Design an enzyme around this catalytic site. Structure first.
Site, mmCIF file in Angstrom:
data_model
loop_
_atom_site.group_PDB
_atom_site.id
_atom_site.type_symbol
_atom_site.label_atom_id
_atom_site.label_comp_id
_atom_site.label_asym_id
_atom_site.label_seq_id
_atom_site.Cartn_x
_atom_site.Cartn_y
_atom_site.Cartn_z
ATOM 1 N N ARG A 51 0.442 2.027 -8.308
ATOM 2 C CA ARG A 51 0.344 1.747 -6.885
ATOM 3 C C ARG A 51 -0.857 2.386 -6.223
ATOM 4 O O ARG A 51 -1.607 3.116 -6.859
ATOM 5 C CB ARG A 51 1.654 2.080 -6.150
ATOM 6 C CG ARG A 51 2.452 3.249 -6.677
ATOM 7 C CD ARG A 51 1.745 4.545 -6.397
ATOM 8 N NE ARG A 51 1.327 4.645 -5.002
ATOM 9 C CZ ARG A 51 0.416 5.508 -4.574
ATOM 10 N NH1 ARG A 51 -0.156 6.331 -5.440
ATOM 11 N NH2 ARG A 51 0.072 5.546 -3.296
ATOM 12 N N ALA A 53 -3.637 0.962 -3.134
ATOM 13 C CA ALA A 53 -4.492 -0.216 -3.006
ATOM 14 C C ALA A 53 -5.692 -0.323 -3.955
ATOM 15 O O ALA A 53 -5.838 -1.319 -4.665
ATOM 16 C CB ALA A 53 -4.963 -0.342 -1.557
ATOM 17 N N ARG A 94 1.988 -8.441 -4.431
ATOM 18 C CA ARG A 94 2.201 -7.735 -3.181
ATOM 19 C C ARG A 94 1.179 -8.261 -2.191
ATOM 20 O O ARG A 94 0.023 -8.488 -2.544
ATOM 21 C CB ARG A 94 2.078 -6.223 -3.395
ATOM 22 C CG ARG A 94 3.150 -5.664 -4.353
ATOM 23 C CD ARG A 94 3.054 -4.147 -4.508
ATOM 24 N NE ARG A 94 3.390 -3.456 -3.269
ATOM 25 C CZ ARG A 94 3.053 -2.202 -2.983
ATOM 26 N NH1 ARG A 94 2.342 -1.478 -3.832
ATOM 27 N NH2 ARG A 94 3.415 -1.680 -1.828
ATOM 28 N N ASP A 240 -4.293 0.356 3.410
ATOM 29 C CA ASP A 240 -4.075 -0.780 2.508
ATOM 30 C C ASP A 240 -4.858 -1.978 3.005
ATOM 31 O O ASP A 240 -5.129 -2.925 2.273
ATOM 32 C CB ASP A 240 -2.593 -1.129 2.443
ATOM 33 C CG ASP A 240 -1.787 -0.044 1.792
ATOM 34 O OD1 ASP A 240 -2.016 0.215 0.591
ATOM 35 O OD2 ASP A 240 -0.940 0.560 2.483
ATOM 36 N N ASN A 250 -1.062 0.671 6.793
ATOM 37 C CA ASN A 250 -0.993 1.703 5.773
ATOM 38 C C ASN A 250 0.482 1.955 5.523
ATOM 39 O O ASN A 250 1.325 1.260 6.092
ATOM 40 C CB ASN A 250 -1.674 2.974 6.277
ATOM 41 C CG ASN A 250 -1.897 3.984 5.180
ATOM 42 O OD1 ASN A 250 -2.493 3.672 4.141
ATOM 43 N ND2 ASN A 250 -1.433 5.204 5.401
ATOM 44 N N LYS A 251 0.797 2.936 4.686
ATOM 45 C CA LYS A 251 2.191 3.239 4.369
ATOM 46 C C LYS A 251 3.024 3.371 5.628
ATOM 47 O O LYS A 251 2.547 3.875 6.639
ATOM 48 C CB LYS A 251 2.296 4.541 3.582
ATOM 49 C CG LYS A 251 3.720 4.882 3.161
ATOM 50 C CD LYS A 251 4.343 3.730 2.376
ATOM 51 C CE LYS A 251 3.463 3.311 1.192
ATOM 52 N NZ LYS A 251 3.776 1.911 0.792
HETATM 53 C C1 LIG Z 1 -5.573 4.696 -2.162
HETATM 54 S S1 LIG Z 1 -4.085 4.804 -1.357
HETATM 55 C C2 LIG Z 1 -4.303 3.676 -0.029
HETATM 56 C C3 LIG Z 1 -3.032 3.053 0.462
HETATM 57 O O1 LIG Z 1 -2.823 1.837 -0.200
HETATM 58 C C4 LIG Z 1 -1.843 3.986 0.264
HETATM 59 O O2 LIG Z 1 -2.081 5.185 0.964
HETATM 60 C C5 LIG Z 1 -0.593 3.459 0.862
HETATM 61 O O3 LIG Z 1 -0.558 3.736 2.014
HETATM 62 C C6 LIG Z 1 0.494 2.650 0.111
HETATM 63 O O4 LIG Z 1 0.400 2.510 -1.325
HETATM 64 P P1 LIG Z 1 1.546 1.774 -2.148
HETATM 65 O O5 LIG Z 1 1.004 0.939 -3.215
HETATM 66 O O6 LIG Z 1 2.029 1.038 -0.992
HETATM 67 O O7 LIG Z 1 2.440 2.789 -2.612
#
Ligand SMILES: CSC[C@@H](O)[C@@H](O)C(=O)COP(=O)(O)O
Ligand SMILES: CSC[C@@H](O)[C@H](O)C(=O)COP(=O)(O)O
Lengths: 349, 349
Positions: A51, A53, A94, A240, A250-251
């Site tokens: 996981r 991005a 996703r 993201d 983002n998350k």
């Molecule tokens: C390089 S991390 C950038 C974002 O994609 C990450 O912080 C995030 O917020 C969610 O990642 P995820 O794949 O949803 O677990």
């Protein structure tokens, strides 16, 4: 082992295989998988075995390239036709993370003028790899540019896991923490556990401890009380997808943190390379927000924390309006003012 | 059983024993334990086998009264003196909720005129029970007073578990949801799981479903995205201690919830009986915030979710400044501001 962040762990190209660190087995065990088919890659992305991005883009890319091998065909047009089918497939894993589509579309465009099948295959592999090495440099520059925002001893809050395994290595939001520890500035970071998937306590708390970085874990609901009680200096997060106007998806939780930061008048910073920007999406409101399996919220690492049939709202991302963003850090530098104008001037070439 | 909320389950006096619901096991299973010693009552409290400010008070009161029966002495003054050692012990249980001290203090006062040791003892029990019977009535009024604040079909967000099992019966913040359900007022409740103990996940979501209340579970970090995406119309929480200032001490996360609510211009309500007010402290800074064993955050049920030795900050409560409070609901009705003067008027009866 405090150097582990500078070595690729999330994803590695093996020519005939794609090796990925299994993030769902951390912090307990550190295991590696061998993805051989796009079904494997599709599965790793969707179930979060891999996981973050940037790393998802890299894997999707290596995924499309590995899978293009077995595309035994005479024609290059037919090759493309077949290639497009595998792309759509891996792209439907996703929604939110632009990097996914961006990687696939990059590999797709690399064979648009191809003349032969073998030349295409090679193109795909070379383009995939180039994407990974390029991500490595940006992370490295993102780490540098961002550290400029912190003074010695600052207490930084963060969410999710935007570090070394969420990217090729080094990371983005966490990158400056690895550098600061190099330049001896006693930075203290507070990592929100990031429910329901807990990327904060399971991966973030894990990799920073590994790097000898000072990190304190807290639940997400503790943010506000922590900003006050601990007087944190700032909040830095990854992304993201960033809309053409600065709106960052983002998350889930990030949006609550940004509103919290503003209330305490603590600068909120977003770090992410150009590959995570989406210049064709006008605002955050048009960004697809993924909603995952509800059992994510009803259970954790195995057993019950809620009644079986309780209805849950499980969004995996939220949107932070660009106006609550004090700055966005990329490989090219730090933007602050009018983001729409900044985003543009940023993609001159 | 929807009507299960209208019957005592948290704590029940039995002359030679105090029965409580073992809240550690919810929602998995419903189990009652028998408490017969001062050490037991003390264990149940510290280990959260019984929790929620009023239930803690009611339970502590019964324990004091229960342990006082073992006191061997013809001398009433020696009796009260002893009652004080047991009282300190029970009080050093947990620091934040005033209801404990209040009930223990209320029982101590019931014997200060006692002429006999047998009279004093009888006194303690009657007083303990009366506190219990009075809380039930206050819960009723509060559920009925806060219901005036809500309308048919509106979405409400709450945190922790200020309901049926955290009080004698009926509850406080959750009281109006039950009352709304018996009159068919369509209410949609949004409950924050409430990390790290998960009182919202294991208790609130459990008793609300078990009452036919329409509840939806979210993580604490989803609040901001939910208040906006679900157009939340209000927030109502319970309270562990309100200062003469109005400053409310409540489950960690409330504070951020209150500030997210103010940003979204969503009214914020605190529901709590008079016994939860503390006129001896002038503001929230004077309120002891308990910090619990960091293990609650690193693991759950033996399943770790973080590196076993990562540093943790585990405050179980935070403070919501009266300024971020739209209203406080007590058995007396609703207060909307100028709280000091207001709660001052309140206590002169
Ligand atoms: C390089 S991390 C950038 C974002 O994609 C990450 O912080 C995030 O917020 C969610 O990642 P995820 O794949 O949803 O677990
Ligand atoms: C009727 S309960 C109201 C409060 O005491 C509040 O809900 C709370 O925060 C709980 O504390 P806890 O730690 O669970 O005992």
């Amino acid at each position: 082992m405090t150097h582990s962040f500078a070595v690729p762990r999330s994803v590695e190209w093996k020519e005939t295989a794609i090796t990925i660190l299994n993030q769902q087995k951390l912090p307990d065990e550190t295991e590696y998988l061998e993805l051989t088919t796009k079904e494997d890659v599709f599965d790793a992305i969707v179930t979060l075995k891999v996981r973050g991005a940037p790393a998802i883009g890299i894997t999707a890319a290596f995924g499309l390239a590995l899978a293009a091998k077995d595309i035994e065909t005479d024609n290059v047009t037919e090759f493309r036709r077949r290639l497009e089918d595998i792309k759509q497939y891996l792209n439907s894993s996703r929604p939110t993370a632009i990097n996914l589509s961006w990687a696939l579309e990059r590999l797709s465009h690399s064979v648009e003028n191809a003349i032969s099948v073998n030349e295409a295959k090679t193109n795909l592999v070379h383009e995939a790899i180039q994407i990974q090495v390029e991500d490595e440099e940006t992370c490295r520059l993102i780490g540098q540019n961002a550290l400029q925002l912190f003074k010695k001893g600052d207490r930084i809050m963060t969410i999710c896991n935007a570090g070394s395994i969420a990217t090729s290595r080094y990371g983005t939001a966490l990158a400056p923490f690895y550098l600061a520890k190099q330049k001896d500035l006693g930075l203290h970071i507070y990592a929100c556990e990031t429910r329901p998937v807990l990327q904060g306590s399971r991966l973030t708390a894990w990799e920073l401890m590994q790097g000898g970085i000072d990190v304190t874990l807290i639940t997400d609901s503790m943010a506000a009380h922590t900003m006050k009680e601990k007087q944190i200096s700032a909040v830095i997060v990854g992304a993201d997808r960033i809309a053409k106007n600065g709106d960052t998806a983002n998350k889930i939780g990030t949006y609550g943190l940004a509103i919290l930061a503003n209330a305490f008048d603590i600068p909120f910073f977003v770090a992410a390379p150009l590959s995570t920007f989406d210049t064709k999406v006008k605002c955050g409101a048009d960004i697809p927000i993924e909603e995952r399996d509800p059992e994510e919220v009803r259970q954790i690492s195995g057993v019950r924390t809620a009644p079986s049939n309780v209805p849950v709202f499980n969004p995996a991302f939220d949107i932070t309006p660009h106006d609550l963003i004090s700055g966005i850090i990329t490989e090219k530098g730090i933007m602050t003012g009018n983001y729409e104008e900044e985003i543009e001037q940023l993609f001159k070439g």
